[PDB]
Amino acid sequence: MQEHYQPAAIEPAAQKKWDDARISNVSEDASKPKYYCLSMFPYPSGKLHMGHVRNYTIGDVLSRFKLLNGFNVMQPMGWDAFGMPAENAAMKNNVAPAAWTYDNIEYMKTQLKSLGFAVDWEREVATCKPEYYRWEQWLFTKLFEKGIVYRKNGTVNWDPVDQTVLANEQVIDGRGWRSGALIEKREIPMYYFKITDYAEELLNDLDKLEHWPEQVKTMQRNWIGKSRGMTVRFAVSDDSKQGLEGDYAKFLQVYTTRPDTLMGATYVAVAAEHPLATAAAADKPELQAFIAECKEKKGVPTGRYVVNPLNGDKLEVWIANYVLWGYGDGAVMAVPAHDERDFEFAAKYNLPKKQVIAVGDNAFDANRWQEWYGDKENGVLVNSGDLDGLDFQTAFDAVAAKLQSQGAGEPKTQYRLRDWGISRQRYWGCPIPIVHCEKCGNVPVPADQLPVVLPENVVPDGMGSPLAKMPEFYETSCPCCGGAAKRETDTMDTFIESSWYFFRYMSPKFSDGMVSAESAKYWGAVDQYIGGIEHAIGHLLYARFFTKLMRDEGLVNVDEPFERLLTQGMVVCETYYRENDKGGKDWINPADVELTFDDKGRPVSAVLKADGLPVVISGTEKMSKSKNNGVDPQELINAYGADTARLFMMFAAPPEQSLEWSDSGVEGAHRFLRRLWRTVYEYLKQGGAVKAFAGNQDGLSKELKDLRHKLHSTTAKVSDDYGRRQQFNTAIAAVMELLNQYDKTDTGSEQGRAVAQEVLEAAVRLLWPIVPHICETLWSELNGAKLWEAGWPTVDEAALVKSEIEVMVQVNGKLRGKITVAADASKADLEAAALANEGAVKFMKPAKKIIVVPGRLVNIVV
Ligand SMILES: Nc1ncnc2c1ncn2[C@@H]1O[C@H](COP(=O)(O)OP(=O)(O)OP(=O)(O)O)[C@@H](O)[C@H]1O
Ligand SMILES: CC(C)C[C@H](N)CO
Ligand SMILES: [Mg+2]
Ligand SMILES: [Mg+2]
Ligand SMILES: [Zn+2]
């Protein structure tokens, strides 16, 4: 065994040894239980950084742990190669989108392979190749036939910098998720996935996700934004139906999320476009002056009345500016004693306020809005007839019973969520499989003629959709009539691919469907998913929707894609930038910046070392490829070795917690790896290997007994930490503690060396998921078997039994007590414990003499 710890020697070798054994290349093996552990795959938007190390070392640790426990482990990796992140990274580097993506993919494969991750590279996938995206083209056409995908004009979010429309999930604080520019409103046709159709299931199936962080689940609940309301009809009075036709003559329909207040409505409000507004203004020009005014909070009375269904009150109808014709009903009711928006409006014109809710008994002031009025949680109903005394839940159902039995209403559910707009005016994206024919309409491309192949030799000129200036691409024949027609030039958003790729990993070479039935039946769902919480509202919602879509088609048979979700905390570091002449920002790596400090130690100035000219200091921020603040793992592997990169990131903090970059933390992770190497080498220099201690330990010294206790305690604690707590920093700390006691333990005797062997064989296996290169090498110097067949270390709980004795206690001869003591518990602690529990102190004045038998009995004399 060499004595210097040289990563560049042992690390490539260990990777070659794992690769040759094909340990990470798994198939649908029914003899082993399956474990699908997946980390969120990267965009080719630059170099990987130490945040990615943390992300994927977490995954690798969980996979390697389950592999050592006999599981059949699939840990795949691929590339989110389509869409905006790879294209923008390509144009900022003035490279063709295809050329850049394929080059960055190979650099990221190089970067990841130097880290020794146990990845099944035979399932590698690049979402920009036709053999991938043809299958989402196929799913598009099928859904389009059913109308689950549809095209429609409407108001959309427009990113002026990326020159494309985004989905509502791609707008972050009114700005583009990639550009950061303010989003404008525009009316553009778009292809939508009808995600509102699945709004109820996506909300209710979050209750199934017991191993998801509750933040992700509540954030998706608030994004789906469910509200249970009530459709309510107020009949038009027998003397206001002038000019009204159809249903608009007989009733005024409104919506309300507070149907419990219905007995308190004192007037209604109507839209200028609502038909009762037009017949009321037909002979009243001042009403048409308001109808022309907007079409702030203003309103006019109309003198036409509608009847409350629940008590027969005749309420006056108001033209109001806050009733946007597009409400669904275009009209509301107004309970001003319990809605702030309505109390303000009905103080503007002195309308009445009847109170119908009491909270405990907060006194009711008619012209003084108190916050308890809108309490939908701690209130019971007042002045409401047989609805008196009900709470909000019970009064909801009772109003629905009332309204439905007379037909005047019914519950109606609304969602803040809107359909998913996936069209993009961009080149580097999966082509949309539609052909517009002047005779047949928007027709899908037949399954036999898929994929519609995106040409890869294009460079965007940065001036609109490049495919739309390419008649060689869009001029085609109609699939239905043979006539001339044009291809859809918009492409699919990048979140299409990432919504199903976890299935593609199960059969990436399958050429007849999205995923083959035999492999989807085997791999089931992703057992473990690891990725940042920033995906809560977009990807982690999209992927549940797609999974349900694929299930309803018969491709998969799971309801949810990811059983366990671990959201790792962000590695953060400094970030700098300049402002470019295009109004944007040019981000700069802290390694190209030279700082100037204050007298107190604060950075004051920062200049780029290339030109000495200043740069702006942006402060600590998440390590990001798009903000050019990453620490490259290859620059650490070359200097310190891959294991040090891995050990530092699993040790600095618990996986969920924020981690700040520091050079001290890298040196420390290395000195421990030297300590591990030095420990195994020194043990081997003074004797060589021996058969690890096992079996009964009667006869071992107390000191080595204590060590075996520390040993199997640690194995138990590391096992609990990998596979229940999923806390890796504390698994590493426990092994250090084990090594601390080993350093303090004389292990030179024949039995001591057998215990040293047992400890070291255990330690390197315990740390193999975290630092596999150094452990695999050390294991081979200690033991000739294959590490992954020796398996995960077992806890020998015989070694956990404490070394104790139970001595007799007597008073003047006759036995009256029994006490527990340590093995080497001195006669003073013995005699003190003997004269300190029941039998001796209840039959005792002090003792005249205490004769002690060494480790047998102690007799009190009185
Ligand atoms: N600083 C970081 N710390 C921890 N995890 C990170 C960090 N940056 C990215 N990740 C995670 O790595 C995975 C891949 O992210 P991605 O490919 O978007 O890289 P990125 O650094 O975010 O690049 P970009 O800024 O262009 O999006 C995701 O699970 C993401 O949450
Ligand atoms: C699963 C995907 C949405 C993750 C992206 N490729 C990186 O954030
Ligand atoms: Mg990202
Ligand atoms: Mg369950
Ligand atoms: Zn046609």
Q: Using the atom order of ligand 1, give the atom closest to the CA of residue 43.
A: 17
The first and second tokens of residue 633, run together, are 């793992």
Task: Check if 622 has its Cβ closer than 6 Å to any atom of ligand 1.
Answer: yes
Task: Check if 55 has its Cβ closer than 6 Å to any atom of ligand 1.
Answer: yes
Q: Report which bound ligand comes closest to the CA of 486.
A: 5
Q: Are 454 and 475 in contact (CB under 8 A)?
A: no
Q: Using the atom order of ligand 1, give the atom closest to the CA of residue 48.
A: 21
Q: Are 745 and 693 in contact (CB under 8 A)?
A: no
Shortest-distance Cα residue to atom 5 of ligand 2: 42
Residues in the chain: 862
State the Cα–Cα distance between residues 291 and 330, nearest whole angstrom.
14
- 767 shares its domain with 843: no
Contacts of 314 (CB under 8 A, 6+ apart): 237, 305, 306, 307, 308
Q: Are 431 and 454 in contact (CB under 8 A)?
A: yes
State the alpha helices, DSSP H only, in 192-295: 199-204, 214-224, 247-250, 275-281, 285-293
State the Cα–Cα distance between residues 677 and 674, nearest whole angstrom.
5
Q: Report which bound ligand comes closest to the CA of 437.
A: 5
Shortest-distance Cα residue to atom 31 of ligand 1: 532
- Binding-site residues, ligand 2, Cβ < 6 A: 40-43, 80, 498, 535, 539
Q: What is the CATH number of the domain that holds 607?
A: 2.20.28.290
Q: Are 494 and 164 in contact (CB under 8 A)?
A: no
Task: Check if 45 has its Cβ closer than 6 Å to any atom of ligand 1.
Answer: yes
Helix (H) or strand (E) holding 472: helix 471-474
State the Cα–Cα distance between residues 553 and 542, nearest whole angstrom.
17
**Which of these three, 800, 822, 841, is where a domain ends?**
800
The first and second tokens of residue 590, run together, are 């802290």
If you compute the radius of gyration of the chain from its CA atoms, what whole number of angstroms results?
36
Beta sheet of 616-617, edge-to-edge order:
585-588, 576-579, 616-617
Long-range contacts of 704-709 (CB under 8 A, 24+ apart): 704/745, 704/747, 704/751, 704/752, 704/755, 705/799, 705/803, 706/741, 706/745, 707/741, 707/742, 707/745, 707/747, 707/755, 707/759, 708/755, 708/758, 708/796, 708/799, 709/799, 709/800, 709/802
How many CB atoms within 10 Å of residue 390? 18
Solved by what technique?
X-ray
C-alpha distances out from residue 620 to 277, 426, 598, 665, Å: 57, 33, 18, 17
Beta strands in 609-694 (DSSP E): 616-617, 621-622, 659-660
Q: Report which bound ligand comes closest to the CA of 208.
A: 4
Q: Using the atom order of ligand 2, give the atom closest to the CA of residue 535.
A: 3
State the Cα–Cα distance between residues 504 and 531, nearest whole angstrom.
19
Q: Report which bound ligand comes closest to the CA of 538.
A: 2
Q: Report which bound ligand comes closest to the CA of 54.
A: 1
The first and second tokens of residue 55, run together, are 């992300």
Q: Report which bound ligand comes closest to the CA of 55.
A: 1
- Report the half-sphere exposure of 458 (CA within 13 A, side-chain side): 20
Strands 857-861 and 849-852, by their bridges, are antiparallel
Shortest-distance Cα residue to atom 23 of ligand 1: 625
State the Cα–Cα distance between residues 608 and 595, nearest whole angstrom.
9
The CA-to-CA distance between both ends of the chain, in Å, stands at 67
SS3 letters across 483-494: CEEEECCCEECC
- Residue 733, burial from CB neighbour count under 10 angstroms (0-12, 13-18, 19+): middle
What are residue 37's DSSP bridge partners? Answer: 528
Task: For 788-823, give one letter per residue: b (16+ CB within 10 A) or e.
Answer: beeebbeebeebeeeeeeebbbbbeeeebbebebee
**Given ligand 1 and candidates 38, 54, 55, which is best to mutate, with the most ligand atoms within 8 Å of its CB?**
55
Cα dihedral: 742, 745, 750, 754 (round 10): -20
439 C-alpha to ligand 5 centroid (Å): 5
Contacts of 842 (CB under 8 A, 6+ apart): none
708 in a structural domain: yes
538 in a structural domain: yes
Shortest-distance Cα residue to atom 15 of ligand 1: 42
Q: Are 335 and 259 in contact (CB under 8 A)?
A: no
208 C-alpha to ligand 4 centroid (Å): 5
- Residue 276, burial from CB neighbour count under 10 angstroms (0-12, 13-18, 19+): buried
The first and second tokens of residue 589, run together, are 């790596």
DSSP class of 226 = E
Task: Check if 531 has its Cβ closer than 6 Å to any atom of ligand 1.
Answer: yes
Give which of 788, 790, 776 is closest to 9, Cα–Cα: 776
Give just the sign of the alpha carbon dihedral 473, 477, 480, 485.
positive
40 C-alpha to ligand 3 centroid (Å): 10
- 715 shares its domain with 614: no
Strands 331-334 and 267-270, by their bridges, are antiparallel
552 C-alpha to ligand 4 centroid (Å): 20
State the Cα–Cα distance between residues 853 and 249, nearest whole angstrom.
107
Strand, helix or coil for residue 816:
strand
The first and second tokens of residue 631, run together, are 């620490």
98 in a structural domain: yes
The first and second tokens of residue 705, run together, are 């007994």
Task: Check if 573 has its Cβ closer than 6 Å to any atom of ligand 1.
Answer: no
- 358 shares its domain with 377: yes
**Given ligand 1 and candidates 41, 50, 625, which is best to mutate, with the most ligand atoms within 8 Å of its CB?**
625
Structural domain total, the chain? 5
Q: Are 565 and 216 in contact (CB under 8 A)?
A: yes
Q: φ and ψ at 442, to 5 degrees?
A: -90, 105
DSSP class of 445 = P
Q: Report which bound ligand comes closest to the CA of 494.
A: 2
Beta strands in 309-358 (DSSP E): 314-320, 331-334, 357-358
Contacts of 197 (CB under 8 A, 6+ apart): 148
Q: Are 122 and 78 in contact (CB under 8 A)?
A: no
State the Cα–Cα distance between residues 570 and 262, nearest whole angstrom.
49
Strand, helix or coil for residue 334:
strand
Q: Are 527 and 563 in contact (CB under 8 A)?
A: yes
488 in a structural domain: no
Q: Which structural domain range is residue 711 located in?
A: 666-800
- 598 shares its domain with 743: no
Q: Are 45 and 536 in contact (CB under 8 A)?
A: no
**Which of these three, 753, 776, 800, is where a domain ends?**
800
Q: Are 439 and 481 in contact (CB under 8 A)?
A: yes
Q: Which residue has the tokens 């103080």?
A: 347
Give just the sign of the alpha carbon dihedral 504, 507, 512, 518.
negative
- Report the half-sphere exposure of 238 (CA within 13 A, side-chain side): 1
Q: Are 338 and 374 in contact (CB under 8 A)?
A: yes
The first and second tokens of residue 247, run together, are 């249903």
State the Cα–Cα distance between residues 76 and 486, nearest whole angstrom.
38
Give which of 248, 430, 264 is closest to 351, Cα–Cα: 264
Q: φ and ψ at 77, to 5 degrees?
A: -140, 140
- 672 shares its domain with 580: no
**Given ligand 2 and candidates 43, 497, 504, which is best to mutate, with the most ligand atoms within 8 Å of its CB?**
43
58 C-alpha to ligand 3 centroid (Å): 17
Cα dihedral: 352, 356, 362, 365 (round 10): 10
* Share in percent of the chain as helix, strand, coil (round to 5): 40, 20, 40
Q: Are 547 and 582 in contact (CB under 8 A)?
A: no
Q: Which amino acid would we find at residue 468?
A: A
Shortest-distance Cα residue to atom 14 of ligand 1: 42
Contacts of 853 (CB under 8 A, 6+ apart): none
Shortest-distance Cα residue to atom 16 of ligand 1: 42
Strand, helix or coil for residue 541:
helix
State the Cα–Cα distance between residues 779 and 784, nearest whole angstrom.
8
- 607 shares its domain with 704: no
State the Cα–Cα distance between residues 770 and 388, nearest whole angstrom.
64
268 C-alpha to ligand 2 centroid (Å): 48
Q: φ and ψ at 152, to 5 degrees?
A: -165, 145
**Given ligand 2 and candidates 82, 498, 542, which is best to mutate, with the most ligand atoms within 8 Å of its CB?**
498
Q: φ and ψ at 330, to 5 degrees?
A: 70, 25
SS3 letters across 577-604: EEECCCCCEEEECHHHEEEEECCCCCEE
Q: Using the atom order of ligand 1, give the atom closest to the CA of residue 622.
A: 1
634 in a structural domain: no
36 C-alpha to ligand 1 centroid (Å): 21
State the Cα–Cα distance between residues 730 and 806, nearest whole angstrom.
36
C-alpha distances out from residue 483 to 442, 487, 528, 660, Å: 13, 13, 50, 62
- 553 shares its domain with 674: no
- 731 shares its domain with 700: yes
Task: Check if 571 has its Cβ closer than 6 Å to any atom of ligand 1.
Answer: yes
Task: Check if 180 has its Cβ closer than 6 Å to any atom of ligand 1.
Answer: no
Give just the sign of the alpha carbon dihedral 91, 97, 100, 104.
positive
40 C-alpha to ligand 4 centroid (Å): 22
Q: φ and ψ at 848, to 5 degrees?
A: -85, -25
Task: Check if 533 has its Cβ closer than 6 Å to any atom of ligand 1.
Answer: no
Q: Using the atom order of ligand 2, give the atom closest to the CA of residue 41.
A: 6
- 254 shares its domain with 338: yes
DSSP class of 178 = T
How many CB atoms within 10 Å of residue 144? 20
Q: Are 827 and 846 in contact (CB under 8 A)?
A: no
Task: Check if 52 has its Cβ closer than 6 Å to any atom of ligand 1.
Answer: yes
Give just the sign of the alpha carbon dihedral 94, 96, 101, 107.
negative
446 in a structural domain: no
Strands 659-660 and 576-579, by their bridges, are unpaired
Q: What is the CATH number of the domain that holds 827?
A: 3.10.20.590
Whether omega before 451 lies within 30 degrees of 0, making that bond cis, reads: yes
656 C-alpha to ligand 4 centroid (Å): 23
Q: Which amino acid would we find at residue 856?
A: R
221 C-alpha to ligand 2 centroid (Å): 21
Instruction: Report angle CA 739, 744, 745 to the nearest 5 degrees.
Output: 95
Shortest-distance Cα residue to atom 8 of ligand 2: 42
Beta sheet of 621-622, edge-to-edge order:
621-622, 571-573, 659-660
40 C-alpha to ligand 2 centroid (Å): 6
Strands 409-415 and 226-236, by their bridges, are antiparallel
Q: Using the atom order of ligand 2, give the atom closest to the CA of residue 501.
A: 1
660 C-alpha to ligand 3 centroid (Å): 18
Q: Are 50 and 569 in contact (CB under 8 A)?
A: no
Q: Report which bound ligand comes closest to the CA of 52.
A: 1
The first and second tokens of residue 192, run together, are 């939508």
State the Cα–Cα distance between residues 703 and 700, nearest whole angstrom.
8
To the question of whether residue 685 is assigned a binding role by annotation, the answer is no
Shortest-distance Cα residue to atom 12 of ligand 1: 52
Q: What DSSP assignment string belongs to 397-435? A: HHHHHHHHHHTSEEEEEEES---EE-EES-SSSPBP-EE
Strand, helix or coil for residue 228:
strand
Give which of 134, 131, 128, 133 is closest to 97, Cα–Cα: 128
Strands 441-444 and 593-597, by their bridges, are unpaired
343 C-alpha to ligand 1 centroid (Å): 48
- 584 shares its domain with 561: no
Task: Check if 85 has its Cβ closer than 6 Å to any atom of ligand 1.
Answer: yes
Q: Using the atom order of ligand 2, give the atom closest to the CA of residue 539.
A: 3
The first and second tokens of residue 506, run together, are 């199960």
Residue 549, Cα to own-chain centre: how many angstroms? Answer: 20
Task: For 439-475, give one letter per residue: b (16+ CB within 10 A) or e.
Answer: eeeebbbeeeebbbebeeebebeeeebbbbeeeebbe
The first and second tokens of residue 622, run together, are 């998440």
Strands 593-597 and 491-492, by their bridges, are unpaired
How many CB atoms within 10 Å of residue 289? 11
- Report the half-sphere exposure of 774 (CA within 13 A, side-chain side): 32
DSSP class of 570 = P
State the Cα–Cα distance between residues 499 and 538, nearest whole angstrom.
10
Q: Which amino acid would we find at residue 86?
A: A
C-alpha distances out from residue 144 to 147, 151, 191, Å: 5, 9, 9
Q: What is the CATH number of the domain that holds 63?
A: 3.40.50.620
What are residue 810's DSSP bridge partners? Answer: 815, 859
State the alpha helices, DSSP H only, in 700-812: 702-720, 729-743, 750-767, 772-782, 787-790
427 C-alpha to ligand 5 centroid (Å): 26
Q: Are 587 and 626 in contact (CB under 8 A)?
A: yes
**Which of these three, 393, 415, 437, is where a domain ends?**
415
- Residue 630, burial from CB neighbour count under 10 angstroms (0-12, 13-18, 19+): buried
422 in a structural domain: no
Resolution in units of Å: 2.8
Strand, helix or coil for residue 608:
strand
Determine the angle formed by the axes of helices 772-782 and 7-21, rounding to 10 degrees. Answer: 80
- 41 shares its domain with 82: yes
The first and second tokens of residue 527, run together, are 């057992």
606 in a structural domain: yes
State the Cα–Cα distance between residues 81 and 44, nearest whole angstrom.
6
- 509 shares its domain with 400: no
Task: Check if 104 has its Cβ closer than 6 Å to any atom of ligand 1.
Answer: no
Q: φ and ψ at 402, to 5 degrees?
A: -55, -60
